[PDB]
């Protein structure tokens, strides 16, 4: 709803990030290993403070509760593309925030950074995630065979995308 | 009214700057992307401490509430010019402070720093500010086409300026 | 099963780690010289923060009491093997938690890290431990002669291993 | 024919790399901007020397003429995948070396480095290369729309891949 | 003509740059001071090796003679704009290379970096330079009063621009 | 015997070392990924200059032609063990020099460095090498299962060792 | 006389210094641009800690209230000259303390630092100050034309000096 | 006029500079202690490469023979003033080149750097030089008493200046 | 009695070390100059943290009172020897702890660290300590003449030592 | 008396040192300038932590009151000489501590550092200081003409010395 | 003879040092391992340039031939003692240089550094080395049991010493 | 005679300095230990380049042969004093250059550097130099007992000095 906002990741938010990053159910959706020392996380945060190739956001509601995370990575400024990734804390999954956040990230991407294309990756074995994204405007541009090793097996992922033209003329 | 005071920005004012630097509406007037972790801001602040090409001032009232920011950037040592930009916190806007601060900035630029020229950029779609600036003696020297991408599209901005000779000598 | 969790080692867990490292009987299991300084431990921790060739984990119960430690070292990314080490604090041994921790270290190695082989070393003079590793599917691949100097004399150790294919099938 | 040899790139090969990195035609196949001072190249080379996420190989003939470059990047330690990219110097192109080198890269990736998957990107408007790659066992897993801005417009690329199990076991 | 090319500035070209930078007739066109130690020039070259906000080019003919310089500065990757500046060595002024180079720089800008806008600055007192640029597609978007101090006086400069759409649909 | 000498590795010997490291058949003996950059090799050399946990030696003949290489790594100063590796350039194999180099590496380990145990790894698929090590007094202490990924598949290696007491008596 | 003392500037006195530096009327006396950041002031303080070419002193009364500041800069050790600057906080002007501070700065320059010449600059538009310096023995040696840009226009300043021989006799 | 040019000082011109700095009679004009090390000169050159508060120029003739040196120091960007210094090597004095170099330094200060005031110091005991500066439009603004210790005694110097407005009209 | 415990020295024990390092009487037994600012001690401590040629242990009782220090230095990786030195805080001296700690140090040196030889130096004018050490199995291997300048004059010291084989096997 | 001791200077003692160093009556006896920022003093203390060429001591009584300072500087280890300097805080001047401290410093010098010679400097205009030192064993080895500028004038100082042999055979 | 001299070790002499250090017959006399990369040797030389605790000398004859090495280590400046070690290149062993060099090192030690005691270590199994040193004034102060592991065995060494008083009153 | 010239020491003069710094006889006149690797000398040279407390001069003849060295050290900014020391290479000694150079050093110290006092130390057992210095106007202000250990024993040195007022004004 109206009460959801995206603001930049700050040092004070790292305990919430850490807590998610050490949760394997949550990190499987980012095809990332669920082990990260707090120090690894903080030192990488420090290292990338001035990195222009990424934007990391925390999501809050009106009381300032941390709902989840939005990220734009691999921002390329010739091709004007970037990869979008999102995580909703367990407690907040299934409340309808998903679409709002995807929209907010697309708005950031398209009305602020002036990117041309946003793409994401989703487990083919999560076909309800796939559909969601389709309803939010994304379209399948690839079916990556055995791209990621997750939970003892290689899994297929859809690569999906959306263009600036489509998002702004809606 | 007259109770406003200028002083240089310092580390302890940065939570206030940060707050404005993450406000979409406020930053659109500066054509700046509204995202800055506190760490990026502080690190850049630290790096520019001895940088002569800029001056960053904070505006406080008698009881020390932080009202706004006045800055001069791209200060050039030869051409004696600089770009002026101003921000008034939203809770303190529409209180007639603009003029007062624009004049403090002009007075500083021309009676202390000895610059010859000050210019600014203002969105064309912001005619109230254009007007305000004109009344404060600035004059349009350019209409930059599709200069900045703001809130989903390319926009035009006025470049306006004022000379030290004009400002100092007007009433003479 | 459920209550015991595994998370990455943190700077705040270092006094727990140091305390085990001063028990010489506990360090004899890792063939590591006991009695190391807290500062050495901390500075070595700082240095390996981004070292991808190791994973150090702590074992916490439901109330967040530190039970012990599980580590994977010498992780090799071509051969996809690593050495496994485990320590259960003395006040939590005999509670039957070794098995669950071993299974947890194997789950991590094989379902997340995607390694092919996990091996470990055990003193031959610790046949109870050897036996526990045998039940968890480890097989002896070496009987290393006078490999380590422990408590005044050279001792033999067993090298034992398990493959990913065996753990996942 | 069979007289080609692979070895790791080293500092003394950089004038050759530089030459290719400033060639517009050659770099368009890598979707890379064709501008790199020697200094940027050397500095980045130096920085990545111990970087495990990449392997850069040079191809030499019996008399040591530098023919091309074979690289693997984004090597991931868990997923065991990497992106393959190749370049053959223009004076040595159209001499049937492609296949030979693509096979050396596959043989390295799968019989030495123990990767599970290799992928590449090829412009859709480059059907000869797509075909060549297919014949070398790669298979289309995606048609990326308007992925790269090349020579004035946004273009589609095929993402193609090959698995270690398929490659190792085909003839069995 | 066909024989003119743009390649990246290299360390070996710095003696040619220096020689131009210490020539006041040449630097007045860039509103820059004609004093630069070779060491200042080289140390600034070293410092900006990895700067993404600029591209500096040397211009040569077929025998590899240094004809002049092309530069794109203040590249901004949200607004996708940049400032273009050019210098033709004295010996090569008046041979018709000017238009080719402006075209080459626009081609780099528009077919490679994917920028939206290119702008430049010209002395109002050089109205034949102004016209040239007008014929090459640039249009006046400003008349900057007393913007630069040059040869003992403050001088007016036109700010001129061209958009990607116009350059590519020609 | 006499003609072959052993001296420490030097920066000027690095092109010889690099050249062996590009022969994949030669590097398969060290289970080391071949094709490494000269700069990586040099910078790793620079970094380990004062590392007391390794000794890298070159083997020179009477005319100062580089024959091969002998190294001692993972030298442990409590357990007093180390791993031995040896490479004889291809143009000097079949000349019967392996034996002399092994004996020379053992002499160094046991009469100068005062180590207690020397071990090595050998591919099981290289029974000639195993046999040579057996004649020089090494005994198998482990048959490591699928330890290394070589030429497209996991292979077994032998771990073999000799003690100081046996070499000196 | 007695109550007023002079001691070296300290990091804890910096907020006092900063506060004077924001009064533009106070900084006009030093021809220094007012409104400088506390961090710039502190970092410049840190940088000059061991700079032998300056001495910055604070003036304290009997109750340790900061009265003002006295500085000696561009101290030259061959020519043995230095430039003198003094600032008396506004809440302590008109108390007749300038004289005592000048005499104190001269005593320091000539009886401790062993300098030969002390000079200063004063705005011509500040004839009261010029007059005070004249009574303390300073003589005009220069009338510098349009030397500084102050409050919107170029102004003339006096350069004035006193020698060691004159102060000590 | 034409033949004499001015360009920025370069590292390759340093032996020329050093050579003047060892003539004590030449350095007396700059009130600079002569006999400074080449290494000090070079390292100070390295340190000031990006210092915007100075410009050091060399004077070359048609055949690229170094004639002398012209410098602008203490350039202040608010007050827009700077101090001018000039040295003509002894083998090129009496050739009437001082005038052209002064005019060239003023042209640079006022038509490029956009300064408002240029000043210099001259020993009173050098009335020929004072006179030359007077012809080039400089006016005495100060007679500094015993400002410098030169050749065994304190000497007076003249401070002289010219404004931009006067030079440009 | 048996309630003593050894652990490695750590930063927080340094005020105690400092106290002993500035005690003239205590330091004369170590032939060391009794002057060390806390800063010199901490800086050197920090520098030797990863230094393998030494081990520094603190001795604590059941309630954690710091009793003394046991150290081994000049640990040589080849010769497998080290110099042993011990200090018992004065308030805890003459309580029969010496033997107990000397034995803990021997047990560590020979059953954990696998050294072959431990030696120490003792002032000749300190016959009680010589004797104590002899009873603990050390044997005189040298009488160093005028080796150290102590309390105004040059003095002789006994160098005494013990072998691992002797220590481990005595009772066999 | 018995209750006076010498211990090494520590960081915590620097406020007492500073207070003396900014007292001109006290620093004149060391021919030193009475101006030292606390930061200068502390940074020089940090720099010389490992300097073997000096030993700086604080003097206390039984309640741990800071009485003054002892210093051995320019320790040379071939020539085995050093310069001794002492300061007694104003409050403690004239109580008879002087001789005890000189003795303690000589004892340190001669029974611990094993030096051969200790020398000092005293204002000729303080002839009662000269005599004291003579009674403590020092002897004049020089009368340095106008060696130091102090209080507006050049002053003569005696250089006095004592040898280890004499101190230990007493 | 007269033609033997001691001068400080220099970088240019390191190839001669290296050559000796990688000769096990030569390094056994210093109880040192015969393996040293040239780089290890040079980097340690660089590190110890300013170390006051040692003096390393090269020995030459009149034509400037490198004869061997003299070293004074563990120089302690309170106790005024140091360890002396010497090596004569193989080619020059048995020519009578030994005594001259020991004398030269003692002269350096006693007439220049002003040390009180010099000690050395010798293999008990080299009793002709022991006697030599006895004739040069050294005397046994210890018989160190199994002090060093050399050539596959632990060996006993004599510790021998000489005092300044004895060397200078000869 | 008069053909001598002073200039500051520079890096390229260091082989000459090194040669003198390793000469026992030459260094005994400076009470300095005659051992200095080239590296120690260069490193210290480099470190003192901007050190104001010293001046090191080389003496050259018309054809640029390096004759000797004149130095001033411990230059104090307040007391305006310095220690003078001189060395003449042995091949050029006993040629009457001493006086000439001592006078150049005095002329520099007093007419350029504006010092008030110069002093030196000379071995008592070196009466020829004492005398020479006296004739050059220096006067004994101290007889330091057993100040330096030289060639096996402790020796006395004269401290001699000269004032700027005396030197400048003598002939007046």
Curated annotation (Swiss-Prot), chains B, D, I, L:
The keyword Transmembrane does not apply. Pathway: Amine and polyamine degradation; spermidine degradation; Amine and polyamine degradation; spermine degradation. One of its GO terms (cellular component) is cytoplasm. The record marks 83 as: Could be important for selectivity toward long polyamines. It catalyses: an alkane-alpha,omega-diamine + acetyl-CoA = an N-acetylalkane-alpha,omega-diamine + CoA + H(+); spermidine + acetyl-CoA = N(1)-acetylspermidine + CoA + H(+); spermidine + acetyl-CoA = N(8)-acetylspermidine + CoA + H(+); spermine + acetyl-CoA = N(1)-acetylspermine + CoA + H(+). Keywords: Acyltransferase, Cytoplasm, Magnesium, Metal-binding, Transferase. Its EC number is 2.3.1.57. Allosterically regulated by polyamines. Polyamines trigger conformational changes and induce the symmetric closed dodecameric state of the protein when they bind to their allosteric sites. It is an enzyme of class 2 (transferase). Residues 4-161 form the N-acetyltransferase domain. Mg(2+) binds at residues 32, 74. Homododecamer; dimer of hexamers. Exists in solution in a variety of protein homooligomeric states including dodecamers in an open state. The presence of the polyamines spermidine or spermine shifts the equilibrium to dodecamers and induces the formation of the closed, symmetric dodecamers. This is Spermidine N(1)-acetyltransferase. The lineage of its organism: Bacteria, Pseudomonadati, Pseudomonadota, Gammaproteobacteria, Vibrionales.
